[PDB]
Structure 1
Amino acid sequence: VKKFPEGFLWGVATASYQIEGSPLADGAGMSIWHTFSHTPGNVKNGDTGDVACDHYNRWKEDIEIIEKLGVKAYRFSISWPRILPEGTGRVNQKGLDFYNRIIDTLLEKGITPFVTIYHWDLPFALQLKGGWANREIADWFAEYSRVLFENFGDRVKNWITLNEPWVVAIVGHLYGVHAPGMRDIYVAFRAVHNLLRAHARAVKVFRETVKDGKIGIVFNNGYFEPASEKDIRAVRFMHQFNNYPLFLNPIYRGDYPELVLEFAREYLPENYKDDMSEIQEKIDFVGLNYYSGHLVKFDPDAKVSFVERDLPKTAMGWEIVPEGIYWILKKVKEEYNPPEVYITENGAAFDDVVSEDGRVHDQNRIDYLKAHIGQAWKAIQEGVPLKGYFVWSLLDNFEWAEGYSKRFGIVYVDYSTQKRIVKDSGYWYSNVVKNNGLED
């Protein structure tokens, strides 16, 4: 058997825009995901977050599912424009009320809330003022975070400033595949830098307002392997750029990673080091998301291309490489030694079907999760201070530019009826949580 530490936090995760629907209900302002998805051509099948899983109405039911599964922690995000419809200034009590009910319910049911302050749904009003490209967002984000802390910090004690700031910056502002849908490398690197400044300002406000809780930040990570000797530097660059070092080198060491500076120095503000002392504001934990591995080789035509491997893949076409989760956990301890780590997302999209027996037989997803949980266990045996693990996601949901076409839930959602059907993977996970680990 593989038993986890006493009190290890088994969780599930969601994000506001992906599950809630009702984006303009009760005085909410538009987000950049509302306006991005309502722009033709941006999202597969013209899908939007208008209805999603209708969690805005079905939240009590969904939490009852978490409870019934015995899951111990719920990572969810707050929609900024539900709270401050113009991004700064006016606070919307109905927005606070929505999350207050969720928080109180979780606590009543003995489930630990982990709140993601920013999970990509920037108020559209702030995008008009440049959004993450504008240095003043450190102020706007600080003011937003302060509202959350003042209203919820008496009850919520575990906070995450930003979800995947690499994606926010690069996918949103260089690739243009996510909101706000821009393709400018100078903007994208100013967004990187402003994300860090905003994160640090929020941590600073947190220390002034919630003297009893913990705060961290969540990064996407891939397991990059070289296509050979030589290539190994291509791997070094992808790790430094795409993984936690882009942000943790500033936080812990006060500068960007060496190979990021080699590639991107000219795109960063001329005097960006002036902000590094503030960026080093102390954090309580590091959240790592992990899903996939990539074979990487140097390619002269960022000087990196991916090499497709004949490995099992998910419906995203992502290679399944469970040892990657062990690697990234080892590597983060070795590089920055954060006092606590969480796996804040791990999961898989498969072509789920409801069988004639009314069940969803996702053995592929069970196998995926089991292998990664096993590799995480290993890291713990070797001294990584991993305190919890969160499955992405509780529910099938709006998967950004792929729309509803990609199902990551351990619970199936029939969008025609909003019916929830717990998948075999959800039942399997509940048993893992109950046993505090693998093989009964």
Structure 2
Amino acid sequence: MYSFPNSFRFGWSQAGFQSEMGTPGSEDPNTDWYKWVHDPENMAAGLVSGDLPENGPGYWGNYKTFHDNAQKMGLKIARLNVEWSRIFPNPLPRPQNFDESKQDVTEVEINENELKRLDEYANKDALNHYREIFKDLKSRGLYFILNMYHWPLPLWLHDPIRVRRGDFTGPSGWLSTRTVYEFARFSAYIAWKFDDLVDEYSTMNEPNVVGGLGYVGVKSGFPPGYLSFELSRRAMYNIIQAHARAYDGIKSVSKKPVGIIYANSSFQPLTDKDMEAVEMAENDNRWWFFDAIIRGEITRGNEKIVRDDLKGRLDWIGVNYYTRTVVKRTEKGYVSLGGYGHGCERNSVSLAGLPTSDFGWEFFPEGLYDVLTKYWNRYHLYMYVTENGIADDADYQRPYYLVSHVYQVHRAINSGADVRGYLHWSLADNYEWASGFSMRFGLLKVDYNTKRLYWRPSALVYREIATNGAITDEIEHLNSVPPVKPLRH
């Protein structure tokens, strides 16, 4: 047996754009992502699958079913987001003498008057529906982490096709301080409407992926798919201050904890001569970001400064984790290696002989202990495992994947790290971004024709974990690697 603290909670994470649509009435055409995945050119290019989010799992209408199953599964925590675009579908008038050429946004003044003004622009059907959703959630005994942002932006703030095309005269998303400014106000507004229902807050989900795949990893088909190192840095600088400003915005209406959710891989050396490479990879992918929002330490221009408006803007750390990245030393620096972590063949075996998922991601639960303990030793901020899961429609590997990673969380707590929950990605299948519906991450299978949910055997296994607050003696063998011999190589 691996017993968890009585206060530790097991649950799930879910995104608005991925899970809400599918039931008639739920359609939100008002995002960069919606437009992006409907784009004729993007479809023909193969950048997007052709699958459309409006044929999704229908959480908007069927949320009670979702919550019933979650409660049966013994789940006690849930993290999801409101979709900005649902609340503010229509352009807001430009800020009164806010200087959109200024690079830094060191404060955004928000008060009851400014909030009442926004209130007259807000879609009230959308707010009432969310209140209905979150009320049912809460009535099922679920502790509630509300995230403000999980990728899609209002179209009035970002036309992604225009930017893809090389036109920067329009709404430019994270490239514009206007977005930073409106984001601080959206966060404060949501906290102001929903604080009575909410337990903890997250500003954003994996801002690093938004800026990294949006402007560098362009084959991933993420908006706006404009290839530029410079602009990726600009997007990331803006998202950092958008975090800090959202933090201050929420904290002016709430005393409740405000954190952030971030994409992590466990960096691992190719050989024992590659450990500096591991540290450099951690600096470049993790510490630079967190040292900014925690310690105020950012490199702007070519200079290391401390920004007082950035410092101390975080109460907790959302740890998202799926797999490792193997890195080696280069004379010029370091490189990640294909054939490991997220760069493997689908339904096969890594270069290390470890099985890969429907998405080609390598089985590596060790990495979660590494990421949890490294954060803790550096910052001493408590954490939730806000995402962990596997693309696996057949359910072959998920039982082992689930128990193995839950074990690494127990391991981490055993070492002293303050981890207060594990939230599986996800409860049910959903729209996997540019990949469409074929990547299936749920403990529950979705039949998309009928919107019916089924319990994969892994769901039954998770129910054992959750109702017992433990990896029980009877499922403890699943803390191991799925046998590869019966699997595809």
With structure 1 as the length reference, what TM-score do the two structures score?
0.89
**Equivalent AA in structure 2 for residue 12 of structure 1:** W
1:60 alignment partner AA? K
Contact persistence 2:215–2:231 (CA under 8 A): yes
Aligned: 1:117 with 2:117: no
In the alignment of these two chains, the number of paired residues is 417
**Is 412-421 or 168-177 further displaced after alignment?**
168-177
Q: Return the offset for 1:32.
A: 1.0
Q: Which residue of 2 aligns with 1:412?
A: 445
CA distance in 2, matches of 1:70, 1:64: 10
State the match for 2:15 in structure 1: 15
**1:206 maps to 2:250:** yes
Distance 2:87 2:49 in 1: 30
Instruction: Tell me the distance in 1 between the aligned counterparts of 2:379 and 2:185.
Output: 29
The within-5 A match list for 1:427-438 is: 427-438=460-471
d(CA) in 1 for partners of 2:417, 2:87? 36
The superposition leaves residues 365-392 of structure 1 with CA deviations (integer Å, 9 ceiling, x where unpaired) of: 0101101111110110111000111000
Deviations 1:363-420 (A, max 9, x none): 4101011011111101101110001110000111111111111100000001122111
Q: How many angstroms does 1:187 deviate by? A: 1.1
Which of 65, 70, 73 is equivalent to 1:69? 73
8 A Cα contact 1:299 1:305, kept in partner: no
Q: 2:426 aligned with 1:384, yes or no?
A: no
Q: Is the Cα contact below 8 Å between 2:37 and 2:48 reproduced in 1? A: no
Mapped contact 2:11–2:76 kept (Cα < 8 A): yes
Secondary structure of the structure 2 residue equivalent to 1:415 = coil
**Quick one: which amino acid aligns to residue 72 of structure 1?**
K
Q: Which moved more, 1:320-329 or 1:231-240?
A: 231-240
SS in 2 for 1:393: coil
Q: Secondary structure at the match of 1:136?
A: helix
1:266-415 equivalent positions in 2, closer than 5 A: 273=305, 276-299=307-330, 303-308=334-339, 309=351, 310-338=353-381, 340-352=382-394, 362-415=395-448
More helix by share: 1
Q: Distance in 2 between matches of 1:307 and 1:38?
A: 31
Question: Which whole-Å CA distance do the structure 2 matches of 1:322 and 1:195 have between them?
Answer: 30
Between the aligned partners of 2:459 and 2:206, the Cα distance in structure 1 is 25
Provide the residue aligned with 1:241 in structure 2: 284
Structure 1 residue 139 corresponds to structure 2 residue 174: no
Contact 1:223/1:292 (8 A) holds in 2: yes
Alignment identity in percent? Answer: 32
Shift in CA distance, 26/164, structure 1 to aligned 2, threshold 3 Å: closer
Partner SS, residue 10 of structure 1: strand
Cα 1:416–1:25 change in 2 (3 A) is: closer
Question: Which residue of the partner structure matches residue 55 of structure 1?
Answer: 59
* TM superposition shift of 1:43: 4.7
Structure 1 stretches (4+) deviating beyond 4 angstroms?
22-29, 268-274, 299-303
The alpha-carbon deviation at position 5 of structure 1 amounts to 0.5
Note closer, same or farther for the CA distance 1:271–1:303 as it changes in structure 2 (3 Å cut). Answer: closer
Match of 2:195 in 1: 153
Give yes or no for contact 1:215–1:283 (8 Å, CA) kept in 2.
Answer: yes
The answer as to whether partners of 1:347 and 1:393 remain within 8 angstroms in 2 is yes
Cα displacement (A) at 1:299:
5.0
Structure 1, 63-72 or 195-204: larger mean CA deviation: 63-72
* Residue 85 (str. 1) matches residue 89 (str. 2): yes
Bigger mean CA offset, 276-285 vs 194-203: 276-285
Residues 43 and 403 in structure 1, CA contact (< 8 A), matched pair in contact too: no
Give 3-state SS (helix, strand or coil) of 2:157's partner.
Answer: helix
* Partner SS, residue 429 of structure 1: helix
Counterpart amino acid of 1:130?
S
* Equivalent pair of 1:20/1:51 in contact (CA under 8 Å): no
Contact 2:23/2:58, CA 8 A, preserved across alignment: no
* Aligned equivalent of 2:134: 103
Distance across 1 between alignment mates of 2:247 and 2:415: 30
The corresponding residue for 2:30 is 30
Bigger mean CA deviation after superposition, 223-232 or 137-146: 223-232
CA contact (8 A) 2:10 2:76 kept: yes
Q: Deviations over 1:80-139 (max 9, x none)?
A: 100111364521111111210111111222111211110001111101422111123221
SS in 1 for 2:246: helix
Structure 1 residue 269, shift from structure 2 partner: 5.1
Distance in 1, matches of 2:414 and 2:136, equals 34
- Contact 1:43–1:400 under 8 Å retained in 2: no
| Deviation, structure 1 residue 78 | 1.0
Note the 1:172-251 alignment, pairs <5 A: 172-176=214-218, 177=220, 178-211=222-255, 213-242=256-285, 244-251=286-293
**Secondary structure of 1:278's aligned partner:** coil
CA distance in 2, matches of 1:221, 1:54: 29
Equivalent pair of 2:55/2:448 in contact (CA under 8 Å) = no
Q: Name stretches of at least 5 consecutive residues in structure 2 with no aligned partner.
A: 93-117, 159-169, 340-350, 474-489
- Asked if the contact 1:154/1:210 (under 8 Å) is kept, the reply is no
**Cα separation, 2, equivalents of 1:10 and 1:422:** 17
